[PDB]
């Protein structure tokens, strides 16, 4: 229950047991800080949050002192100002004059709080000099200049509590205390880059960005993170035509201040191996060509080949917008085809879970609902490589709650205790009608998280039928207040695809295609496209799909267009263009409209407003931006789509396999990254730097 207290004369109210700094933040009172973070545990080592309380003789730490009723706080008086001055004097005693060569310059809390709450000049002139500290090698992503460490312990707290990487610590004692791995080890985690943002000094910095830019040079665009279906909200920092870095953004219901390393460091791939001009295959060579010539060639291929009905195949890959897929589907249907297809292994056939109700392919117990969790079952998903931030959320819940977690699948090096109980469908049914089934039944907020790798199997109906039966049989998993059936997607376009109906007929499932338009589709195998078919790759990077193509149309990347992306929850988010596309590249729906007009059809929209109206005509949830909708048809969906048409399928005994064999190098932008290549050579479990011999 809330209490009442006074801070600088202002009366404010927060819950009991809260820290004083939280009250000061609610009251609009600014209090300094280096070691306090809203998402990390409370440490009281910087001694910069000191304020005066009438109760206490000495000044007390706002970060740690509990809030009490009737307490009177002052953050204004001479003792507090002198305290801040003294603490900054000691802090900058042994700090190095690296401000020109430091990459935190211009965005340093130490600089700003020295200017605001500290002295104008120093009194340290000792002839013996300052302390020195040797630089650590903790990997190819985080660069270390550890003379600048102020010993806040944010890195350690993050790595040991939020990430599950206990290799970072606090070795030594006193002035010779050094943060790092006591021996040369790597900071092996898919969340390591947030250490760079948490350090208020430049002791831990981005290595590929090391000296590229300063903060004031940068345009800051608030956009959305492709590379996973979490829809992490990001800030793209751009210097003209070049995207310099990507950093996280606050969204407490999606990603909560964090982003993974792919999202942060795959930006290096938007400036190499890009497609800047159209290309025509004349033989074993690609020949650069104009837009008119390439679209002319596509039209002539359509008229020479005469694909009847479902012989025109449309493939959409990861990292594609919704607008592009809608335009491609409208075109493909105007040409008489229903062979809209995903780049997954079993993408030629529609999903076993069906697309009739959105509840069947979404994370219905929303990302903030993991915090409500009491029991979790993980079917065919490693959340550390699929939606790592959601794995961090699962950990966060597990550390503060009674949370019992099980998994049916490959044995996964998890950041929590996971209770592995099988790898087959047999073991799934065993678990669901044995012990963990009753664990799920007696729970008040149980979660059954199914992976997309299950949909990428032939015997997926067997699974989804089993899980659907268990769901409709168990009230606790599906109520009028809570839905525990969740499907975790690993790529950012699948939810929007299924929302717009980007799946194939079964009439088209068995057709051999004569033309194959593949859009951002880099996971094709060279067996899903015939040797005698005319193929059209539309993308932004040449990795796999453009090698196959007969015509290549350069498109725009997610940093170069304002697209709509649907995440796992069903949350539609709108990006924002940071730059324009390079060279002769174009927005992709405009490409599809032009090539429609070159062909014997034409889409009825001509600018972005009409495309938004078409999105509304397809699904009105695609324009309710950032709103996660409930659904009224949970019972109906589990009875119609998951349990009904899947009883005919018989299970395999092939063990479940991991879906993402390398977290790094998952898509075109990452496979074109050299930083991801270095991070794939390193961060391999076979290396001695990445395994501590416990």
């Amino acid at each position: 229950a809330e209490i009442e207290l006074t801070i600088d004369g202002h009366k404010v109210s927060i819950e009991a047991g809260s820290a004083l700094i939280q009250a000061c933040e609610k009251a609009g009172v600014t209090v300094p800080r280096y070691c306090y973070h809203d998402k990390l545990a409370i440490a009281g080592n910087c001694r910069m949050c000191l304020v005066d309380v009438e109760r206490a003789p000495k000044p007390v730490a706002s970060c740690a002192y509990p809030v009490a009723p009737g307490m009177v706080v002052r953050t204004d008086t001479e003792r507090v100002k002198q305290a801040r001055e003294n603490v900054m004097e000691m802090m900058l005693q042994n700090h190095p004059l690296d401000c020109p060569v430091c990459d935190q310059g211009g965005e340093c809390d130490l600089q700003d709080q020295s200017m605001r709450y500290g002295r104008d000049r120093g009194r340290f002139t000792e002839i013996t000099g300052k302390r020195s500290t040797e630089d650590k090698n903790i990997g190819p992503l985080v660069k270390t200049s550890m003379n600048r460490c102020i010993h806040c312990t944010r890195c350690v707290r993050f790595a040991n509590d939020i990430a599950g990487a206990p290799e970072l610590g606090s070795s030594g004692r006193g002035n010779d205390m050094q943060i790092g791995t006591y021996l040369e080890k790597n900071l092996n985690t898919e969340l390591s880059g947030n250490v760079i943002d948490l350090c208020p000094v430049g002791a831990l910095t981005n290595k590929p960005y090391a000296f590229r830019a300063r903060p004031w040079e940068l345009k800051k665009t608030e956009s959305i993170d492709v590379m996973d279906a979490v829809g992490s909200n990001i800030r793209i920092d751009s210097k003209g035509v070049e995207v310099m870095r990507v950093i996280p953004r606050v969204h407490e219901d999606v990603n909560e201040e964090w982003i993974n390393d792919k999202s942060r460091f795959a930006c290096d791939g938007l400036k190499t191996q890009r497609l800047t001009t159209p290309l025509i295959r004349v033989g074993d060579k690609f020949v650069n060509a104009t837009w008119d010539d390439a679209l002319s060639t596509i039209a002539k291929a359509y008229q020479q080949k005469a694909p009847k009905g479902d012989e025109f195949k449309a493939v959409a890959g990861a990292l594609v917008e919704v607008e592009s897929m809608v335009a491609l589907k409208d075109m493909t249907n105007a040409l008489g085809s229903e062979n809209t297809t995903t780049d997954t292994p079993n993408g030629n056939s529609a999903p076993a879970h069906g697309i009739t109700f959105r509840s069947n392919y979404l994370f219905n117990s929303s990302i903030a609902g993991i915090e409500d969790a009491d029991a979790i079952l993980l079917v065919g998903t490693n959340p550390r490589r699929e939606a790592a931030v959601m794995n961090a959320r699962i950990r966060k819940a597990w550390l503060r709650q009674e949370l019992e977690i099980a998994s049916v699948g490959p044995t996964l090096d998890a950041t929590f205790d996971v209770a592995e109980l099988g790898n087959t469908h047999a073991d799934l049914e065993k678990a669901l009608s044995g012990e963990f089934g009753e664990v799920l039944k007696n729970a008040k907020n149980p979660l059954i998280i199914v992976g997309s790798g299950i949909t990428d199997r032939e015997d997926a109906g067997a699974f989804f039928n089993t899980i659907g039966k268990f769901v409709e049989s168990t009230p606790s998993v599906l109520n009028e207040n809570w839905n525990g059936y969740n499907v975790l997607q690993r790529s950012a376009s699948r939810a929007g695809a299924y929302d717009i109906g980007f799946t194939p007929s079964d009439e088209a499932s068995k057709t051999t295609p004569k033309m194959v338009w593949l859009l951002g589709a880099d996971e094709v195998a060279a067996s899903d496209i015939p040797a005698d078919a005319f193929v059209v790759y539309q993308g932004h990077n040449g990795d796999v799909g453009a090698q196959f193509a007969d015509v290549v149309l350069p498109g725009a990347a997610y940093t170069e267009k304002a697209g709509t992306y649907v995440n796992t929850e069903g949350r539609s988010q709108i990006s924002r263009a940071a730059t324009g596309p390079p060279g002769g590249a174009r927005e992709d729906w405009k490409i599809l409209r032009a090539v429609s007009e070159y062909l014997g059809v034409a889409l009825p929209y001509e600018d972005a407003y009409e495309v938004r109206d078409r999105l509304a005509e397809i699904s009105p949830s695609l324009v309710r931006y950032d709103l996660v909708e409930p659904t009224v048809f949970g019972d109906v969906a589990v009875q119609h789509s998951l349990v009904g048409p899947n009883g005919s399928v018989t299970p395999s005994s092939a063990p479940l396999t991991e879906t993402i064999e390398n977290f790094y190098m998952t898509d075109s932008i990452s496979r074109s990254s050299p930083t991801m290549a270095k991070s794939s050579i390193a961060f391999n479990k076979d290396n001695k730097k990445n395994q501590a011999f416990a």
Binding site: E78, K81, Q82, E85, G118, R119, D120, R123
Partner: protein, 61 residues
């Protein structure tokens, strides 16, 4: 340099931070001046005591 600013011992910056001791800009609408007129000032008070003067001020606010 000059002595009281170059001194290394008894020279806290907050005692010579004149920028942050800047004078506020006072603003007086017609409400605030009839308060000074109907009631008085802190130099020449003409206001009742307790809650009576409080809601006497509130009648002008």
């Amino acid at each position: 340099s000059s002595y009281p600013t170059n001194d290394i011992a008894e020279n806290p910056y907050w005692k010579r931070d004149h920028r942050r001791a800047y004078p506020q800009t006072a603003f007086f609408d017609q409400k605030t001046v009839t308060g000074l007129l109907e009631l008085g000032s802190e130099a020449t008070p003409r206001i009742a005591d307790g809650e009576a003067g409080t809601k006497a001020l509130a009648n002008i606010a």
